[PDB]
Amino acid sequence: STPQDNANTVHRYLEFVAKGQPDEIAALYADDATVEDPVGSEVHIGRQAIRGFYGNLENVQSRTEVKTLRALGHEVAFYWTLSIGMTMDIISVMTFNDDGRIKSMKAYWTPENIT
Amino acid sequence: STPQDNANTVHRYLEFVAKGQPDEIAALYADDATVEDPVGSEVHIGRQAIRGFYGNLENVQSRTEVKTLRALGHEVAFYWTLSIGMTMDIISVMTFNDDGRIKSMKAYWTPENIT
Numbered sequence: 366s367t368p369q370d371n372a373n374t375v376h377r378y379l380e381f382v383a384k385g386q387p388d389e390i391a392a393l394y395a396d397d398a399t400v401e402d403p404v405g406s407e408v409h410i411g412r413q414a415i416r417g418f419y420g421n422l423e424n425v426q427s428r429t430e431v432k433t434l435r436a437l438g439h440e441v442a443f444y445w446t447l448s449i450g451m452t453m454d455i456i457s458v459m460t461f462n463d464d465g466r467i468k469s470m471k472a473y474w475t476p477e478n479i480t
Numbered sequence: 481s482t483p484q485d486n487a488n489t490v491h492r493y494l495e496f497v498a499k500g501q502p503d504e505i506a507a508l509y510a511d512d513a514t515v516e517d518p519v520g521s522e523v524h525i526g527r528q529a530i531r532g533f534y535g536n537l538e539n540v541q542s543r544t545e546v547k548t549l550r551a552l553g554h555e556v557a558f559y560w561t562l563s564i565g566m567t568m569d570i571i572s573v574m575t576f577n578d579d580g581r582i583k584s585m586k587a588y589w590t591p592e593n594i595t
Contacts, residue, residue, distance in 0.1 A: 368520075403552055404550075404552040404553050404555050404557070405483075405552040405553025405554075405555070406553075433569070433571070433593070435519075435571060435588040435589060435590060435593070437518055437519040437520040437588060437590070438519050438520030438521075439520075440519050440520070440586075440588070442519070442571045442573075442588035444559055444571060454548070456548070456550060456557045456559060456571060458557075458573060458588075471555075473550040473552055473555070473557035473573075474550060475550060475552070478548070478550070
């Protein structure tokens with residue numbers, strides 16, 4: 366996949382986060398993808414575990430905003446906000462397989478980053 | 481090392497960058513560390529190659545400023561500005577070995593991020 370493809374996929378991801386759609390989110394990930402959210406916590410391995418993880422937002426309407434996004438090589442680093450009044454500003458890095466699905470996600474945030 | 485110490489190492493690094501001390505920068509890296517700057521370019525592997533990479537960049541007086549820094553597990557993600565009337569905003573990720581040396585650095589930026 367190209368960096369443009371991968372940027373588009375990140376926008377998809379944030380769309381489905383905003384709409385509270387964990388099935389759509391999980392479908393963006395590869396079969397043996399990893400999610401580490403937050404960095405430092407136990408990694409979630411495989412789409413089944415990843416789909417379970419994203420139950421934390423099913424039917425949760427929110428708003429997302431990309432502050433800056435850099436699609437380089439097979440990676441995308443993006444700094445963004447999640448608003449559920451309460452707002453989280455998050456630094457995320459995703460990497461992508463050859464087919465364009467997400468191979469890994471890492472999220473860098475703490476409650477210090479909640480307003 | 482602790483996330484606190486790793487955050488401190490990031491600050492040491494940024495001031496060696498500002499003060500043009502490439503051998504002090506290389507000393508912060510592990511002997512088999514990697515630098516990928518920018519992400520997508522050929523990785524520099526080993527402290528010897530890393531020393532050459534920064535030694536190219538030395539004695540330049542620049543200014544560095546952290547906008548936000550998240551030290552989590554054995555990683556630090558930080559969004560910062562490098563001022564050379566040129567300034568650019570960079571998303572960087574460092575990871576650290578048990579002894580606190582930098583194991584890996586990745587820098588996410590392009591010339592689009594130069595103002």
